Amino acid sequence: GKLPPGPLPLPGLGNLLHVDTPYCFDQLRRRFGDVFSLQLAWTPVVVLNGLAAVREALVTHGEDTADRPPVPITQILGFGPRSQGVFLARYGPAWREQRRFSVSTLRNLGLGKKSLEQWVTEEAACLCAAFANHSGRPFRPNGLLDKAVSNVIASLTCGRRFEYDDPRFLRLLDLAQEGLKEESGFLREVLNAVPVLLHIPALAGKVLRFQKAFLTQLDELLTEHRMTWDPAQPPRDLTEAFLAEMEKAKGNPESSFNDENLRIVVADLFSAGMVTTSTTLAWGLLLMILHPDVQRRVQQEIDDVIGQVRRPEMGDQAHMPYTTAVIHEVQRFGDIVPLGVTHMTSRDIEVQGFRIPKGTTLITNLSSVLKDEAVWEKPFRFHPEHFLDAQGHFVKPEAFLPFSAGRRACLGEPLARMELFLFFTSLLQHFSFSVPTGQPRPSHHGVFAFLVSPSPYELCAVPR
């Protein structure tokens, strides 16, 4: 069939100089259509735009697009056939076993005695107190959001939290944010292309220094956890559940439940739901000071449904359509993973008539879905009524895809939904946020990366 169109491919760089990225893709979408091609050096890339193209790839051809592009340099971090974690894992048994394990263990810890909801609610309390200490004084809330969000994951993985001034905790969070920067590095591409370049010890020790440091700090914490683990009792957290599975899997070279995969799985879970959920909440609080009237309606609904003392529960959401709409609109407008996470075709597939060869790198332009002018009333405005009808009922459009879609859709979404609702309501239940008098109106345009964060800003949190 016909291959997707695209700008003229230069000899060596191809379309590398035709892309400086979501803004640039919008122009290409308006010039070549919703499915265009790109030649990024050695890698053949097809960009998918709009709900239909994205759905057709990830749902209709879900079996064939659930794979990841190979990342050879992950060998430095100890990746192997039965140890690929979940996030970057190739489509196959190693991915599926860990995927099913994480999803089911989240659910098991989730239901019963609401361990998840309890850990979040309790961490929300700490976040409130830490906010109270920063009162009467403008302050960036990002650091506190990272910590509270990080503690929720630590609670699920290792069954503990860390104090906000814990030295090892800070180093962990610091190493994690530096590591994220290392993923968007130019040297990553060269070494992924030619794996034998890693046989140079000079280079190998430079590639993922912050990644390796992060995994080292994590190893130390895992070792402590293995000491306190009581195998005579039902697993209290995901790491214990993993360790129990490891015992049963002794003698089985096919199991992905092993030492090498434990640190990778934990690192995937710990980080993927630390910079995403926290950035979303950082967007949330920014949008609340830019739109004080929206903030007041939320706080009003909080009082009408929950009050100003009793801690919020997930059962309250069903009776809080407006707050729910606001949170959704934060994710939509926030648009924090505009190009999602790359997929790869494991077979020859067909998208929007065009042909996609096997082994093609797929980019899901999630931004083009969340900001679709054909779907949303005013997609470039912060507008909670994107999820409300005239009667005030919450409505969720098909195009709400911040967690992507299909087999590889965010496994942490249920937890994320929980963290977002409980942290947001709890903060707005006890605080009123506003721009600091004397300071310029903070921009609503984010700083582009693999993850789009709000521009740096300060705020005032006055108690209620």
Positions that interact with ligand SI5 (CB under 6 A) = 87-88, 176, 179-180, 183, 211, 214, 268, 271-272, 275-276, 337, 341, 450-451
Q: Taking the complex as a whole, how short is the minimal distance between the CB of residue 175 and ligand SI5, in angstroms?
A: 7
Give the pair of three-digit tokens for residue 396. Answer: 């969720």
Residues contacting 194, CB < 8 A, separation 6+? none
Measured at the CA of 392, the angle between CA 390 and CA 396, to 5 degrees, comes to: 90
Q: Taking the complex as a whole, how short is the minimal distance between the CB of residue 461 and ligand SI5, in angstroms?
A: 27
> What φ, ψ does residue 455 adopt, rounded to 5°?
-60, 145
Q: Taking the complex as a whole, how short is the minimal distance between the CB of residue 91 and ligand HEM, in angstroms?
A: 9
Interacting span for Zn ion (CB under 5 A) from 97-105, 146-154, 190-198, 412-420: 146-154
> What φ, ψ does residue 48 adopt, rounded to 5°?
-105, 130
Which of 146, 268 has the CB closer to ligand HEM?
A: 268
Contact 352, 415 (CB under 8 A): no
Task: From the list ligand HEM, ligand SI5, Zn ion, none, pick the one residue 391 interacts with, judged by a Cβ distance below 5 to 8 Å according to partner type.
Answer: Zn ion
Q: Does 332 bind ligand HEM (CB under 6 A)?
A: no
26 has binding-site annotation? no
Which of 3, 341 has the CB closer to ligand SI5?
A: 341
Which of 71, 198 has the CB closer to ligand HEM?
A: 71
Which of 240, 460 has the CB closer to ligand HEM?
A: 240
Q: How far apart are CA 270 and CA 278, in angstroms?
A: 12
Q: Taking the complex as a whole, how short is the minimal distance between the CB of residue 272 and ligand SI5, in angstroms?
A: 4
Per-residue DSSP letters for 404-434?
--STTS-TTHHHHHHHHHHHHHHHHHHEEEE
410 has binding-site annotation? yes
Count of residues interacting with ligand HEM (CB under 6 A): 26
Task: From the list ligand SI5, ligand HEM, Zn ion, none, pick the one residue 158 interacts with, judged by a Cβ distance below 5 to 8 Å according to partner type.
Answer: Zn ion
Q: Does 296 bind Zn ion (CB under 5 A)?
A: no
Q: Where are the alpha helices (DSSP H) in 161-291?
A: 167-183, 186-193, 201-207, 209-228, 238-248, 259-272, 275-290
Q: Does 409 bind ligand HEM (CB under 6 A)?
A: yes
Query: How far lies 32's CA from each of 86, 147, 171, 193, in Å?
Result: 34, 43, 46, 28
Among 56, 97, 146, 237, binds Zn ion (CB under 5 A): 237
Residues 56-75 that bind Zn ion (CB under 5 A): none
Q: Does 285 bind ligand HEM (CB under 6 A)?
A: no
Q: How far apart are CA 153 and CA 284, in angstroms?
A: 20
Contact 322, 46 (CB under 8 A): no
Q: Does 345 bind ligand HEM (CB under 6 A)?
A: no
Largest CA distance in the chain: 66
Count of residues interacting with Zn ion (CB under 5 A): 12
Torsion of CA 217, 222, 225, 227, to 10 degrees: -100
First to last CA, the chain: 63
Q: How far apart are CA 445 and CA 443, in angstroms?
A: 5
H or E stretch including 153? helix 142-157
Residues 252-281 that bind ligand HEM (CB under 6 A): 268-269, 272-273, 276-277, 280
- Nearest one of 443, 186, 144 to 278, comparing CA atoms: 144
Q: How far apart are CA 446 and CA 314, in angstroms?
A: 30
- Contact code string over 347-376 relative to ligand HEM, x by CB under 6 A: -----------------x------------
Among 99, 134, 188, 236, binds Zn ion (CB under 5 A): 236
- Contact code string over 350-389 relative to Zn ion, x by CB under 5 A: ---------------------------------------x
Residue in the shown chain whose Cβ atom is closest to ligand SI5: 179
Which of 73, 461 has the CB closer to ligand SI5?
A: 73
Q: How far apart are CA 452 and CA 422, in angstroms?
A: 23
Q: Does 268 bind Zn ion (CB under 5 A)?
A: no
Contact 159, 236 (CB under 8 A): yes
Q: Does 451 bind ligand HEM (CB under 6 A)?
A: no
Among 156, 207, 221, 351, binds Zn ion (CB under 5 A): 221
Site residues for ligand HEM per CB under 6 A: 86-87, 99, 153, 268-269, 272-273, 276-277, 280, 336-337, 340-341, 364, 402-404, 408-412, 415-416
As annotated, the binding site for heme includes 410
Binding positions: 268, 410
